[PDB]
Write a structure and sequence with these properties.
2 copies of one chain form a homodimer. The first copy, chain A, has no helices and 16 strands. In chain A, the strands form 5 sheets. In chain A, strands 1-7-6-3 form a 4-stranded mixed sheet, with no helix packed on it. With 213 residues, the first copy, chain A, is mainly β. In chain A, 0% of the residues lie in helices and 46% in strands. The radius of gyration of chain A is 28 Å and the shape is rod-shaped. Chain A has 2 domains: 99 residues, Cadherins (Immunoglobulin-like); 112 residues, Cadherins (Immunoglobulin-like, Sandwich), CATH 2.60.40. At the A-B interface, strand 1 and strand 2 of A face strand 1 and strand 2 of B. Bound molecules: calcium ion (6 copies). One calcium ion binds next to loops of chain A. The site of one calcium ion has 8 residues of chain A, from loops. Chains A, B: This is Cadherin-1. Chains A, B: It is found in: Cell junction, Adherens junction; Cell membrane; Endosome; Golgi apparatus, trans-Golgi network. Chains A, B: It comes from Mus musculus.
Chain lengths: 213, 213
């Protein structure tokens, strides 16, 4: 049997609802009056009534904005019943797919990441890793594509930029010489993760680095 | 059989082509690999290739902007063929409907309309009618809803506004007293027709009125 494998709808649509999706009918409507209905989660099962079909015209519609991160795909079936009460078609599968918008900020997996480094470590020495996740669609968009940056370093001594971060991996490394346990044993870095390859929604966390012998 | 009775597409779409319309598949694709194709005017018949279907995925797409005033409805059929060469579904009817944009200016049915009026006619006397048409969708929009106005009167004597026009019907009537064949035997009015109930696209024509005894 034929299936409508996808009718796409972006999440978070604005403007007037309901919105038309597609009109389906039985070509047996030349024989009898036919009445249309739909079943499935999103139709008669929870979330009830997100999708409706006009009983006489067969216009399938969506009645509220969708949310890809809650339900990304709805599987419905359309039904066609004559006025005398006989189903005149085998029910047809109709799938609604929800496309992504950038509506989730990245989140670091920890509020505070801890790491340590030997004071004599040569510039370039990898110290620790910070990590973030993003609930948006990393398959089809850059809405979940995170760039890591360092926002600040406390203290700014002996130099303001003792460390750097790999923009893609979140690995933090020694950038310059001068680390010294006896002068400054601890650094607090504010790190940022931002989606849209660093241009989008952002969040911060801390990396606390202990300088060892 | 089920029919996709309408997938709507506005005419004159901008941005990137091709544009996805709907994805259709055979659920017999669990048994065999299935290849999809479409037939109909707009697909394999003229205008060829305005609609295409991806042979493996079943994504039906439109490849160029549509024009409601040229073709307002396309009737396509989808086909599903196994890799061994057997049609695995009855072809399904899929109708694409083109929705309207206001892209046609009203047009008067004549460049010059002629009428006459007796000089003693009381104010309110109907003189003649001007008429315009509009190729846009008068059923579903106001894109063809015309308001008539008078733009100018030559000569502006004895008064600047000797006539008026019914905004809906285009009937021109005597507005005030003072018409006189021996003083001014002829008036040329520039008349305007504008769609969007007078707010939209506009055109002009002339109404030449002869004053009789
Ligand atoms: Ca969402
Ligand atoms: Ca995001
Ligand atoms: Ca999202
Ligand atoms: Ca047009
Ligand atoms: Ca128009
Ligand atoms: Ca039009």
């Amino acid at each position: 049997d034929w299936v409508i494998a996808a009718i796409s709808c972006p999440e978070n649509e604005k403007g007037e609802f309901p919105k038309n999706l597609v009109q389906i009918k039985s070509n047996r409507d030349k024989e009898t009056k036919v009445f249309y209905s739909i079943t499935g989660q999103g139709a008669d099962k929870p979330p009830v009534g997100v999708f409706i079909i006009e009983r006489e015209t067969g216009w399938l519609k969506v009645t509220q904005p969708l949310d890809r991160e809650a339900i990304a795909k709805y599987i419905l079936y359309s039904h066609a019943v004559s006025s005398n009460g006989e189903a005149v078609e085998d029910p047809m599968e109709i799938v609604i797919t929800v496309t992504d918008q950038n509506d989730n900020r990245p989140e670091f997996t920890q509020e505070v990441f801890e790491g340590s480094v030997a004071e004599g470590a040569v510039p370039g020495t990898s110290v620790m890793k910070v990590s973030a996740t993003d609930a948006d669609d990393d398959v089809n968009t850059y809405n979940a594509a995170i760039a890591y940056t360092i926002v600040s370093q406390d203290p700014e001594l002996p130099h303001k930029n003792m460390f750097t971060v790999n923009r893609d991996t979140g690995v933090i490394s020694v950038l310059t010489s001068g680390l010294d346990r006896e002068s400054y044993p601890t650094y607090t870095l504010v790190v940022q993760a931002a989606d849209l390859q660093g241009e989008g929604l952002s969040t911060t966390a801390k990396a606390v680095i202990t300088v060892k012998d």
